[PDB]
């Protein structure tokens, strides 16, 4: 018999992004080919199968720095981190291959699906 | 020129609630008249003007335990904590006064608004 507030999840995510932009309560640095990205472990886990696995590991859950595979492109990661905190994906002809490869590595199934569809349309 | 994934914010919140239910990466205990509630500081801040003010304070941001005013009802808090993580509010004739009072104290404006409207309809 609950009532539901339609905009609540969006408003929560908007506030989480405001905290990220002001570097409030960020608890991890993600290192991508020397580029550094500060974030909240819980948001990373909520969006990515890879971060979910990393931060549920009894040893890795305590790390303040995570280094990604050197093949990962920092721009592709940046676009995906922005998507995690906003639901908006900056998908462009010039970045689609790097975004899809990063989303496959991060295990972000819905992003991989839209990249596959956008690539299929251009062939 | 971004594309947007409609269900992303809801899916993020659903995963944050799964982490809460499994007590994963919870970093604070909220004490309400001896009852204890584990949660994520970032989610509390994203939903409540009171928690936002508390955890942006340079001393309180580091506390692992927060004690609420003794007038706060633990059931009212529990219903509001559930709403924070789900967008669903269990509003009932028997709890509406305690829920509104707790939402006013926590500074959850949209919850206060619906409680005022539901109370006005019964008079």
């Amino acid at each position: 018999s609950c009532i539901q507030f339609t905009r609540h999840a969006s408003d929560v995510l908007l506030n989480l992004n405001r905290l990220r932009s002001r570097d409030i309560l960020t608890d991890v640095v993600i290192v991508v080919s020397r580029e550094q990205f500060r974030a909240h472990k819980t948001v990373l886990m909520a969006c990515s199968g890879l971060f979910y696995s990393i931060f549920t590991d009894q040893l890795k859950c305590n790390l303040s720095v995570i280094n990604l595979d050197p093949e990962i492109n920092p721009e592709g990661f940046c676009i995906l981190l922005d998507f995690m905190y906003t639901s908006r994906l900056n998908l462009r002809e010039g970045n689609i291959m790097a975004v899809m490869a990063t989303a496959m590595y991060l295990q972000m199934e819905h992003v991989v699906d839209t990249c596959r569809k956008f690539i299929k349309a251009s062939e | 020129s971004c594309i947007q994934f409609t269900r992303h914010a809801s899916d993020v919140l659903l995963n944050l609630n799964r982490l809460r239910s499994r007590d994963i990466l919870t970093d604070v205990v909220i004490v309400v008249s001896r009852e204890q509630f584990r949660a994520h500081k970032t989610v509390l801040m994203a939903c409540s003007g009171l928690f936002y003010s508390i955890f942006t304070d340079q001393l309180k941001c580091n506390l692992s335990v927060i004690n609420l005013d003794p007038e706060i009802n633990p059931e009212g808090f529990c219903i509001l904590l559930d709403f924070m993580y789900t967008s669903r509010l269990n509003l009932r004739e028997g709890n509406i006064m305690a829920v509104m009072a707790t939402a006013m104290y926590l500074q959850m404006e949209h919850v206060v608004d619906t409680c005022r409207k539901f109370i006005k309809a019964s008079e």
């Binding site: 609950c2 009532i3 539901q4 507030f5 339609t6 | 669903r88 509010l89 619906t114």
Partner: peptide, 4 residues
């Protein structure tokens, strides 16, 4: 607010 809605009935979910």
């Amino acid at each position: 607010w809605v009935i979910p």
